[PDB]
Amino acid sequence: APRPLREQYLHFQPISTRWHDNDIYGHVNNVTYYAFFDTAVNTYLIERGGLDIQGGEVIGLVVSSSCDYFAPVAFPQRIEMGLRVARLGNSSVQYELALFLEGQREACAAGRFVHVFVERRSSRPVAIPQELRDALAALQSSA
């Protein structure tokens, strides 16, 4: 089975839920979890890896992603992303994430996604800059 626990992740981010996260069936819509993934990863890249989204030469593009869902959460509930790095490559990295509900031990959902690092003007993949590598390595998972 699962399920994922908080101590299996390296870094955490609270994310506040918004009215419109819920859909017609009353819980956070599956699409929104990936917004959560994307937000946790890039928040980390900016505060700890020197990512410059406004004018930086090198950017992370999502080449792929996925998620399994174990139990719903709903606005206005309080949640938290665990983030870890499964592998750091030469020009890409695979993240693993998990959504946690405040007060619950087991993850509501767990997924992965993959960045490739490219030159912003051309979109040629490029070796990950060093400052970013240092930050990404600091997230290395245990398994």
- Binding region for its own copies (CB under 8 A): 1, 14-20, 22-26, 29-32, 34-36, 38-39, 42-43, 46-47, 53-54, 59, 61-69, 74-76, 111, 113, 116, 120, 123, 125
Q: Smaller CB distance to its own copies: residue 34 or 104?
A: 34
Nearest Cα neighbor of 64 from 95, 88, 89 is 95
DSSP 128: P
Closest distance to its own copies from the beta carbon of 8 (Å): 19
Q: Smaller CB distance to its own copies: residue 54 or 142?
A: 54
Lookup: tokens for 64: 């792929």
Supply φ then ψ for residue 43, to 5 degrees: -55, -50
Closest distance to its own copies from the beta carbon of 83 (Å): 13
Lookup: tokens for 5: 């626990």
Lookup: tokens for 95: 């993240």
Closest distance to its own copies from the beta carbon of 139 (Å): 17
Q: Smaller CB distance to its own copies: residue 18 or 105?
A: 18
Q: Smaller CB distance to its own copies: residue 48 or 142?
A: 48
Closest distance to its own copies from the beta carbon of 96 (Å): 14
Closest distance to its own copies from the beta carbon of 74 (Å): 8
Q: Smaller CB distance to its own copies: residue 8 or 42?
A: 42
Q: Are 81 and 40 in contact (CB under 8 A)?
A: yes
Query: How far apart, in whole angstroms, are the C-alpha atoms of residue 48 and residue 134?
Result: 9
Residue 140 to residues 53, 87, 105, 108, 134, Cα–Cα distance (Å)? 23, 7, 21, 22, 11
